[PDB]
Design a protein around this ligand. Structure first.
Ligand SMILES: [Zn+2]
Ligand SMILES: [Zn+2]
Lengths: 125, 130
């Protein structure tokens, strides 16, 4: 089992950047896949990116070329670098982990953080 | 002569990251030094970082190892990547440009943006990184 804690959220101008971190506590972090999901109010919790135990990555089409997922097993930490942020990215961002799956389905991850709020302004504001 | 506009500011959790951009309008952007300066409440506009027209960099001791200044001459844009943000970093951040400046002095830069606000939460709100 792992416990996860996200950090790095904020409220930024469109086109800006943020970096989210997810700090894991528990045994065998290197054996977990890590996922990022996001939920806007009155919307379903959606796949953003995942990284496998071998650093194989997967991204939603909506964030390809803008977001980068990574991990540092020595720090038991995962990261989501978010560049060229858009108002469509506003949401609570959750990190999730699982040893038995590495998919784009939220039901396939059994360990979740509490979430970090990301807010992005309108375009050209 | 260039016109500058900063973007990318915001409010962020202590320990987080931002990236500020400075878009320049005008001729010969690649011939200008670009500086970032910041003004916290009750403070003067202080040097943060500069990049010369030959890509030579200079950082304030308070941001060395956390901030990275860069430029994209093809996009007439400069950048300030800010990692491991601290409450000490809360300020209005200004970009400045000059063809004839090789100093940390705000009087050596003749072209200024209007500023972008950066607000970092309290130290206590930050986690202990591994
Ligand atoms: Zn599972
Ligand atoms: Zn000058």
């Amino acid at each position: 089992q792992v416990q996860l804690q996200e950090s790095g959220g904020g409220s930024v101008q469109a086109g800006g950047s943020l970096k989210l971190s997810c700090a894991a506590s528990g045994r065998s972090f290197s054996t977990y896949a890590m996922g990022w999901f996001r939920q806007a109010p009155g919307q379903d919790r959606e796949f953003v990116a995942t990284i496998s135990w071998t650093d194989s990555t997967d991204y939603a089409d909506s964030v390809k070329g803008r977001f980068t997922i990574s991990r540092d097993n020595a720090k038991n930490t995962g990261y989501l670098q978010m560049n060229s942020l858009k108002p469509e990215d506003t949401a609570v961002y959750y990190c999730a982990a699982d040893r038995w799956a590495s998919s784009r389905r939220n039901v396939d991850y059994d360990y979740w953080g509490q979430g970090t709020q990301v807010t992005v302004s309108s375009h050209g504001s």
